[PDB]
Ligand binder design. Structure first.
Ligand code: RET
Length: 133
């Protein structure tokens, strides 16, 4: 389904360290971040998304409209400028972040009662699975 609305709690996180390292997230931050639990809150109305990711210490918050390119500064993450675009490929939501890093972005989709998130950067892929809270 294309409906990704809800509050989603992480149950699995594969190669998170590899992905953070590919983004050059500093080693000391990685140590704190790597095994934190995550809650992902998605508000979706038509093309309009509001996405909030939360953990004990960190948050990543972003609003976008499907099909509308937006320039991003990746602030507390890796401090880079990218050109972001989120679109649908079937029922997979696909984000491409054009910039220095190759293959940078994510894909998000629903299967059953679960949300799947694939984060990509360089040659690294991180796969996360969430259950609806
Ligand atoms: C569509 C879902 C998206 C775009 C989720 C993005 C989530 C992040 C970029 C996660 C960031 C982090 C945390 C939530 C805490 C652990 C360390 C970070 C900064 C990598």
């Amino acid at each position: 389904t294309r409906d990704q609305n809800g509050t989603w709690e992480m149950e699995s996180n594969e190669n998170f360290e590899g992905w953070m390292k590919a983004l050059d997230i500093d080693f000391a931050t990685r140590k704190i971040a790597v095994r934190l639990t995550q809650t992902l809150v998605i508000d979706q109305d038509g093309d309009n998304f509001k996405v909030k990711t939360t953990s004990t210490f960190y948050n990543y918050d972003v609003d976008f409209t499907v099909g509308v390119e937006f320039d991003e500064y990746t602030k507390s993450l890796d401090n880079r400028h990218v050109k972001a675009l989120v679109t649908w490929e079937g029922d997979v939501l696909v984000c491409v972040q054009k910039g220095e890093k190759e293959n940078r972005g994510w894909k998000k989709w629903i299967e059953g009662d679960k949300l799947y998130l694939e984060l990509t950067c360089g040659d690294q892929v991180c796969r996360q699975v969430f259950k609806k809270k």
